[PDB]
Amino acid sequence: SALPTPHEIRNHLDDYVIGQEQAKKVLAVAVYNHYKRLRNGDTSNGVELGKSNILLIGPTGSGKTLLAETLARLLDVPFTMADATTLTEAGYVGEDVENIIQKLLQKSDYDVQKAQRGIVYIDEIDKISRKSDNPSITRDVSGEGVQQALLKLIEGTVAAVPPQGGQQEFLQVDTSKILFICGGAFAGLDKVISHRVETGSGIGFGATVKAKSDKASEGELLAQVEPEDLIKFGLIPEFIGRLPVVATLNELSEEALIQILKEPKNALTKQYQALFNLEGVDLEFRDEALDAIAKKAMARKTGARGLRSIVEAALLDTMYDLPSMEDVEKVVIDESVIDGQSEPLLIYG
Amino acid sequence: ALPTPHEIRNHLDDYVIGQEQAKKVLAVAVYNHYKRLRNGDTSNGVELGKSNILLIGPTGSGKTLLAETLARLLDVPFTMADATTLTEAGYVGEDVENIIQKLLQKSDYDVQKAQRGIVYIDEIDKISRKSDNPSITRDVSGEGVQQALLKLIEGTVAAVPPQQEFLQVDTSKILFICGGAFAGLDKVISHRVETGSGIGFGATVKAKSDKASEGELLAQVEPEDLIKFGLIPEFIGRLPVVATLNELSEEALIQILKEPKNALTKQYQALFNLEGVDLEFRDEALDAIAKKAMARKTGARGLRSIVEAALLDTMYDLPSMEDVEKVVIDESVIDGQSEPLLIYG
Ligand SMILES: Nc1ncnc2c1ncn2[C@@H]1O[C@H](COP(=O)(O)OP(=O)(O)OP(=O)(O)O)[C@@H](O)[C@H]1O
Ligand SMILES: Nc1ncnc2c1ncn2[C@@H]1O[C@H](COP(=O)(O)OP(=O)(O)OP(=O)(O)O)[C@@H](O)[C@H]1O
Ligand SMILES: [Mg+2]
Ligand SMILES: [Mg+2]
């Protein structure tokens, strides 16, 4: 009856996500505004309140997809996730844009009224970016073609969704009040921002030589992202315009990674503890080991996904012989094991 | 009594700002269509013909907004479509015949009313063929759609599902309107309007300072320019009158903030009112927002990003704050060096 305040929504997100406060507020505000719009569906005012789509930009592994999954748990309206890569322009073998609404209907029991007020997430939106360098000779059905088909969907159109099979009987869903959240790990966008901001070049005496250290980081550059930068990446102005709200996720730091190992509800350390717990052994990760794991992952530049690789390598040998071993009760992992100067100590008993 | 074009233009002003040619062409076109409906019999020997309109304008100019406003004050059936979803006959994609099907549904299957209506086709620039060269690989969503609509816009008989008795409907008296952004058309116009731009003393070098703007450049658009951008000449003929919207200016944007009946400021003010808090937008703050919006190049759509960006923090914590009664948005908040003043009741 009472719409949850954004603070409560953010608290729930923190249970699974660690950091990205700016993105959390945008998502919480969007849900609060969407709920208010739904609660005010009768338009008890003198205006036709519009929507504001979000664009979750950030380095791979920052938690863009994770946020969408967590939102679907605390959401009250229908929710659905999509993949821009499979989408293709109408009239081709590839999947059509209208398929997104079909999935949303399944979550709403094929209720047009319910599906007309849900939320939708489109992951890998950066992949459909038009190949600006490529000549405008062959229609980019997989890229620019998909963006052009989503212009009316985001703004609002009577999408034709199949009526659960086989012309006629085609359902008519209006995507006017549906909220869309696009996400994608834009690769190379930082360079575009650097040229527009750094503007450091030249070889002559009257030039401005810049040191490699003065160069900013991807996170810093991405923070100062502007729509002009997206145009060079491959996004048409008609597409970015429909997405006025833009959120940026910073690059997880070493300290933040240490929290990911445990703080998240399904944190990496907890996942491996259950694996060992069901087998009858206790798994403990020393705080010192977590620091080394985070440091190694910081170099792989693979986000939180790099943490799993470090744990697997350290526990690869243990998981190969531990099941055959007997009387093993607990396994302790120290920083030395992460570096390779020791092996996990086995507490027999 | 049929309404005069001035009345139609006045209604469009309530929701649109800074668009004279668009309103005039639409009002005149609608006025002519209304007169044709009044004399549908056309007893007079002369067989009065129709003139379709083509809308050209940058993003956030009001092309899709004008069509929506027209459907409210209109009396005959109206329909909106998307050229991207359309495809030539015999393919999984949507067919052009479905356009009349939606129009027929809006008239409760009234063929008489369907034969006299208006149809708006958005994203017409999308179907534009990538290149004017021969289509080695048939463009199902490109030339195919244009060729399929050649007879529909000009006028012919179309077969639509009854509800294989495909109901026959004539499209000779139905008005069709097309709209698109045509990203890059300005370059084509410049290549034609501007010539002799190369290296040399006798050549001309604008330096980008004197170069014509996108808005005025499109105002000088000619049919030949559209051919280079990619469009079948047969399709251009079906659209004799071409309306070109101008890029909104800083002053024009400031008016769109509040003048529209459903302006952005009003929408945000109503949103806070529904929660229980009052919102006030200062005139000085509006100008600052317009300046930043004019730099995004996204048209009116950029205003929503600036407003929500400044109110992002406020809307996140305002629902928790108690006793707050009104918020004052000053120009300092727009730049980001200040926080919206909070008034505690
Ligand atoms: N802040 C975070 N808190 C908790 N887990 C996180 C966080 N960031 C990333 N993860 C982990 O990331 C994994 C999911 O990948 P994630 O959603 O981060 O990728 P992505 O950035 O959306 O990918 P893409 O490269 O396709 O754009 C999950 O295991 C989740 O635990
Ligand atoms: N002059 C204007 N006054 C008020 N609102 C405007 C104006 N121009 C655009 N808008 C806003 O534009 C939105 C509707 O989209 P619009 O018709 O501008 O699209 P467009 O620029 O033609 O898009 P595209 O060319 O990509 O199809 C509405 O939110 C409307 O408020
Ligand atoms: Mg992802
Ligand atoms: Mg439009």
PDB file of C-alpha atoms in Angstrom, chain B residues 88-253:
ATOM      1  CA  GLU B  88       7.810  -5.707 -48.190  1.00  0.00           C
ATOM      2  CA  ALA B  89       5.023  -8.210 -48.781  1.00  0.00           C
ATOM      3  CA  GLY B  90       5.881 -11.872 -48.324  1.00  0.00           C
ATOM      4  CA  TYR B  91       8.182 -11.551 -45.297  1.00  0.00           C
ATOM      5  CA  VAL B  92       7.980 -12.177 -41.560  1.00  0.00           C
ATOM      6  CA  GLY B  93       8.148  -8.430 -40.982  1.00  0.00           C
ATOM      7  CA  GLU B  94       5.068  -6.256 -40.753  1.00  0.00           C
ATOM      8  CA  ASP B  95       3.350  -5.335 -44.019  1.00  0.00           C
ATOM      9  CA  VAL B  96       2.259  -1.896 -45.196  1.00  0.00           C
ATOM     10  CA  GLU B  97      -1.329  -3.163 -45.389  1.00  0.00           C
ATOM     11  CA  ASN B  98      -1.369  -3.403 -41.585  1.00  0.00           C
ATOM     12  CA  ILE B  99      -1.290   0.409 -41.462  1.00  0.00           C
ATOM     13  CA  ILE B 100      -4.844   0.599 -42.794  1.00  0.00           C
ATOM     14  CA  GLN B 101      -5.814  -2.310 -40.540  1.00  0.00           C
ATOM     15  CA  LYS B 102      -5.003  -0.207 -37.479  1.00  0.00           C
ATOM     16  CA  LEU B 103      -6.820   2.740 -39.059  1.00  0.00           C
ATOM     17  CA  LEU B 104      -9.829   0.519 -39.750  1.00  0.00           C
ATOM     18  CA  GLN B 105      -9.846  -0.656 -36.125  1.00  0.00           C
ATOM     19  CA  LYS B 106      -9.918   2.976 -34.965  1.00  0.00           C
ATOM     20  CA  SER B 107     -13.119   3.560 -36.981  1.00  0.00           C
ATOM     21  CA  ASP B 108     -14.936   0.449 -35.690  1.00  0.00           C
ATOM     22  CA  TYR B 109     -14.588  -1.103 -39.156  1.00  0.00           C
ATOM     23  CA  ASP B 110     -16.245   1.910 -40.815  1.00  0.00           C
ATOM     24  CA  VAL B 111     -14.974   1.775 -44.397  1.00  0.00           C
ATOM     25  CA  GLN B 112     -16.535   5.167 -45.141  1.00  0.00           C
ATOM     26  CA  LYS B 113     -14.577   6.793 -42.307  1.00  0.00           C
ATOM     27  CA  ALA B 114     -11.412   4.809 -43.063  1.00  0.00           C
ATOM     28  CA  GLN B 115     -11.330   6.060 -46.661  1.00  0.00           C
ATOM     29  CA  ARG B 116     -11.124   9.640 -45.276  1.00  0.00           C
ATOM     30  CA  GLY B 117      -8.466   9.785 -42.565  1.00  0.00           C
ATOM     31  CA  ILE B 118      -4.912  10.823 -41.761  1.00  0.00           C
ATOM     32  CA  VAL B 119      -1.932   8.536 -41.164  1.00  0.00           C
ATOM     33  CA  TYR B 120       1.426   9.521 -39.660  1.00  0.00           C
ATOM     34  CA  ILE B 121       4.482   7.403 -40.492  1.00  0.00           C
ATOM     35  CA  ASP B 122       7.313   8.074 -38.050  1.00  0.00           C
ATOM     36  CA  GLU B 123      10.961   7.177 -38.659  1.00  0.00           C
ATOM     37  CA  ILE B 124      10.521   7.508 -42.429  1.00  0.00           C
ATOM     38  CA  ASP B 125      14.232   8.337 -42.662  1.00  0.00           C
ATOM     39  CA  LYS B 126      15.076   4.871 -41.303  1.00  0.00           C
ATOM     40  CA  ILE B 127      13.700   2.966 -44.302  1.00  0.00           C
ATOM     41  CA  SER B 128      15.881   5.227 -46.476  1.00  0.00           C
ATOM     42  CA  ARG B 129      18.128   3.004 -48.578  1.00  0.00           C
ATOM     43  CA  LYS B 130      21.704   2.979 -47.297  1.00  0.00           C
ATOM     44  CA  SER B 131      22.908   3.900 -50.792  1.00  0.00           C
ATOM     45  CA  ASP B 132      21.262   4.877 -54.070  1.00  0.00           C
ATOM     46  CA  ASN B 133      23.312   2.260 -55.939  1.00  0.00           C
ATOM     47  CA  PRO B 134      21.611  -0.917 -57.202  1.00  0.00           C
ATOM     48  CA  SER B 135      20.422  -3.158 -54.370  1.00  0.00           C
ATOM     49  CA  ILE B 136      22.511  -6.279 -54.926  1.00  0.00           C
ATOM     50  CA  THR B 137      20.933  -7.684 -51.736  1.00  0.00           C
ATOM     51  CA  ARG B 138      17.220  -6.816 -51.711  1.00  0.00           C
ATOM     52  CA  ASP B 139      16.553  -4.346 -48.886  1.00  0.00           C
ATOM     53  CA  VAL B 140      13.516  -5.913 -47.227  1.00  0.00           C
ATOM     54  CA  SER B 141      13.347  -3.056 -44.713  1.00  0.00           C
ATOM     55  CA  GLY B 142      14.827  -0.477 -47.102  1.00  0.00           C
ATOM     56  CA  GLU B 143      13.758   0.077 -50.703  1.00  0.00           C
ATOM     57  CA  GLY B 144      11.176  -2.681 -50.268  1.00  0.00           C
ATOM     58  CA  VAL B 145       9.112  -0.579 -47.870  1.00  0.00           C
ATOM     59  CA  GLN B 146       9.438   2.516 -50.065  1.00  0.00           C
ATOM     60  CA  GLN B 147       8.355   0.632 -53.187  1.00  0.00           C
ATOM     61  CA  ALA B 148       5.459  -0.988 -51.316  1.00  0.00           C
ATOM     62  CA  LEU B 149       4.196   2.406 -50.097  1.00  0.00           C
ATOM     63  CA  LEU B 150       4.462   3.994 -53.563  1.00  0.00           C
ATOM     64  CA  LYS B 151       0.887   3.054 -54.482  1.00  0.00           C
ATOM     65  CA  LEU B 152      -0.483   3.414 -50.939  1.00  0.00           C
ATOM     66  CA  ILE B 153       0.556   7.067 -50.688  1.00  0.00           C
ATOM     67  CA  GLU B 154      -0.394   7.817 -54.300  1.00  0.00           C
ATOM     68  CA  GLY B 155      -3.686   5.926 -54.012  1.00  0.00           C
ATOM     69  CA  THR B 156      -4.820   2.367 -54.735  1.00  0.00           C
ATOM     70  CA  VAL B 157      -6.917  -0.501 -53.375  1.00  0.00           C
ATOM     71  CA  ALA B 158      -5.527  -2.452 -50.420  1.00  0.00           C
ATOM     72  CA  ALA B 159      -6.628  -5.798 -48.988  1.00  0.00           C
ATOM     73  CA  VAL B 160      -6.872  -6.087 -45.196  1.00  0.00           C
ATOM     74  CA  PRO B 161      -8.056  -9.024 -43.033  1.00  0.00           C
ATOM     75  CA  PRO B 162     -11.835  -8.972 -42.396  1.00  0.00           C
ATOM     76  CA  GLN B 163     -11.519  -8.920 -38.604  1.00  0.00           C
ATOM     77  CA  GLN B 164     -10.206 -15.095 -46.935  1.00  0.00           C
ATOM     78  CA  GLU B 165     -12.636 -12.170 -47.211  1.00  0.00           C
ATOM     79  CA  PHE B 166      -9.907  -9.522 -47.266  1.00  0.00           C
ATOM     80  CA  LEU B 167     -11.891  -6.287 -47.016  1.00  0.00           C
ATOM     81  CA  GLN B 168     -11.052  -3.910 -49.867  1.00  0.00           C
ATOM     82  CA  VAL B 169     -10.231  -0.292 -48.999  1.00  0.00           C
ATOM     83  CA  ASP B 170      -9.217   2.627 -51.224  1.00  0.00           C
ATOM     84  CA  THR B 171      -6.225   4.775 -50.228  1.00  0.00           C
ATOM     85  CA  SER B 172      -6.769   7.513 -52.830  1.00  0.00           C
ATOM     86  CA  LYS B 173      -8.412   9.949 -50.381  1.00  0.00           C
ATOM     87  CA  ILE B 174      -6.504   8.981 -47.214  1.00  0.00           C
ATOM     88  CA  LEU B 175      -3.901  11.534 -46.140  1.00  0.00           C
ATOM     89  CA  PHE B 176      -0.428  10.243 -45.270  1.00  0.00           C
ATOM     90  CA  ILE B 177       2.229  12.148 -43.315  1.00  0.00           C
ATOM     91  CA  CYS B 178       5.861  11.090 -42.923  1.00  0.00           C
ATOM     92  CA  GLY B 179       8.441  12.221 -40.389  1.00  0.00           C
ATOM     93  CA  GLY B 180      12.127  11.590 -39.796  1.00  0.00           C
ATOM     94  CA  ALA B 181      15.385  13.054 -38.559  1.00  0.00           C
ATOM     95  CA  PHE B 182      17.542  12.256 -41.618  1.00  0.00           C
ATOM     96  CA  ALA B 183      20.843  12.253 -39.738  1.00  0.00           C
ATOM     97  CA  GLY B 184      23.490  13.343 -42.244  1.00  0.00           C
ATOM     98  CA  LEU B 185      21.175  15.068 -44.727  1.00  0.00           C
ATOM     99  CA  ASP B 186      22.828  18.369 -43.792  1.00  0.00           C
ATOM    100  CA  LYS B 187      26.129  17.084 -45.191  1.00  0.00           C
ATOM    101  CA  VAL B 188      24.473  16.294 -48.532  1.00  0.00           C
ATOM    102  CA  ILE B 189      22.971  19.786 -48.691  1.00  0.00           C
ATOM    103  CA  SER B 190      26.320  21.382 -47.846  1.00  0.00           C
ATOM    104  CA  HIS B 191      28.075  19.387 -50.579  1.00  0.00           C
ATOM    105  CA  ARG B 192      25.548  20.827 -53.086  1.00  0.00           C
ATOM    106  CA  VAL B 193      25.007  24.346 -51.658  1.00  0.00           C
ATOM    107  CA  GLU B 194      28.734  24.771 -51.001  1.00  0.00           C
ATOM    108  CA  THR B 195      31.095  24.068 -53.894  1.00  0.00           C
ATOM    109  CA  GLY B 196      34.706  24.815 -54.747  1.00  0.00           C
ATOM    110  CA  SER B 197      35.810  23.987 -51.186  1.00  0.00           C
ATOM    111  CA  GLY B 198      39.344  22.644 -51.530  1.00  0.00           C
ATOM    112  CA  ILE B 199      43.030  23.474 -51.155  1.00  0.00           C
ATOM    113  CA  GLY B 200      44.200  26.607 -52.955  1.00  0.00           C
ATOM    114  CA  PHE B 201      44.104  30.396 -52.898  1.00  0.00           C
ATOM    115  CA  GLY B 202      41.020  30.545 -55.121  1.00  0.00           C
ATOM    116  CA  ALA B 203      39.186  27.902 -53.102  1.00  0.00           C
ATOM    117  CA  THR B 204      36.831  28.757 -50.237  1.00  0.00           C
ATOM    118  CA  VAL B 205      37.537  27.918 -46.587  1.00  0.00           C
ATOM    119  CA  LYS B 206      34.623  28.534 -44.214  1.00  0.00           C
ATOM    120  CA  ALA B 207      36.653  27.483 -41.116  1.00  0.00           C
ATOM    121  CA  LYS B 208      33.383  26.137 -39.571  1.00  0.00           C
ATOM    122  CA  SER B 209      32.665  29.655 -38.248  1.00  0.00           C
ATOM    123  CA  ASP B 210      30.630  30.875 -41.233  1.00  0.00           C
ATOM    124  CA  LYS B 211      29.412  27.370 -42.137  1.00  0.00           C
ATOM    125  CA  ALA B 212      25.627  27.172 -42.220  1.00  0.00           C
ATOM    126  CA  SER B 213      23.937  25.501 -39.265  1.00  0.00           C
ATOM    127  CA  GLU B 214      22.021  22.234 -39.498  1.00  0.00           C
ATOM    128  CA  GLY B 215      18.692  24.014 -39.038  1.00  0.00           C
ATOM    129  CA  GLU B 216      19.056  26.488 -41.893  1.00  0.00           C
ATOM    130  CA  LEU B 217      20.812  23.877 -44.045  1.00  0.00           C
ATOM    131  CA  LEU B 218      17.753  21.616 -43.957  1.00  0.00           C
ATOM    132  CA  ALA B 219      15.539  24.601 -44.806  1.00  0.00           C
ATOM    133  CA  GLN B 220      17.199  24.661 -48.249  1.00  0.00           C
ATOM    134  CA  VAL B 221      16.693  20.926 -48.822  1.00  0.00           C
ATOM    135  CA  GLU B 222      15.779  19.940 -52.381  1.00  0.00           C
ATOM    136  CA  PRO B 223      14.554  16.655 -53.889  1.00  0.00           C
ATOM    137  CA  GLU B 224      17.984  15.995 -55.413  1.00  0.00           C
ATOM    138  CA  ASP B 225      19.512  16.124 -51.927  1.00  0.00           C
ATOM    139  CA  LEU B 226      17.159  13.393 -50.716  1.00  0.00           C
ATOM    140  CA  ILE B 227      18.252  11.149 -53.598  1.00  0.00           C
ATOM    141  CA  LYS B 228      21.880  11.255 -52.454  1.00  0.00           C
ATOM    142  CA  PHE B 229      20.878  10.590 -48.838  1.00  0.00           C
ATOM    143  CA  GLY B 230      19.016   7.548 -50.189  1.00  0.00           C
ATOM    144  CA  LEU B 231      15.407   7.624 -51.385  1.00  0.00           C
ATOM    145  CA  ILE B 232      13.650   6.365 -54.510  1.00  0.00           C
ATOM    146  CA  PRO B 233      12.624   9.341 -56.701  1.00  0.00           C
ATOM    147  CA  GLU B 234       9.185   7.764 -57.131  1.00  0.00           C
ATOM    148  CA  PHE B 235       8.663   8.082 -53.370  1.00  0.00           C
ATOM    149  CA  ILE B 236       9.627  11.773 -53.377  1.00  0.00           C
ATOM    150  CA  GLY B 237       6.868  12.542 -55.871  1.00  0.00           C
ATOM    151  CA  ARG B 238       4.255  11.039 -53.495  1.00  0.00           C
ATOM    152  CA  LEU B 239       5.389  13.732 -50.969  1.00  0.00           C
ATOM    153  CA  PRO B 240       5.257  17.087 -52.801  1.00  0.00           C
ATOM    154  CA  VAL B 241       5.146  19.437 -49.792  1.00  0.00           C
ATOM    155  CA  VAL B 242       8.069  18.999 -47.386  1.00  0.00           C
ATOM    156  CA  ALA B 243       8.006  20.672 -43.967  1.00  0.00           C
ATOM    157  CA  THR B 244      11.365  21.341 -42.298  1.00  0.00           C
ATOM    158  CA  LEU B 245      11.431  21.958 -38.554  1.00  0.00           C
ATOM    159  CA  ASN B 246      14.169  24.179 -37.141  1.00  0.00           C
ATOM    160  CA  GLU B 247      16.486  23.221 -34.296  1.00  0.00           C
ATOM    161  CA  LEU B 248      15.175  24.593 -31.008  1.00  0.00           C
ATOM    162  CA  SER B 249      17.115  27.580 -29.687  1.00  0.00           C
ATOM    163  CA  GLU B 250      18.033  28.441 -26.112  1.00  0.00           C
ATOM    164  CA  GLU B 251      15.183  30.956 -25.899  1.00  0.00           C
ATOM    165  CA  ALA B 252      12.704  28.506 -27.436  1.00  0.00           C
ATOM    166  CA  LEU B 253      13.733  25.753 -25.015  1.00  0.00           C
TER     167      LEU B 253
END
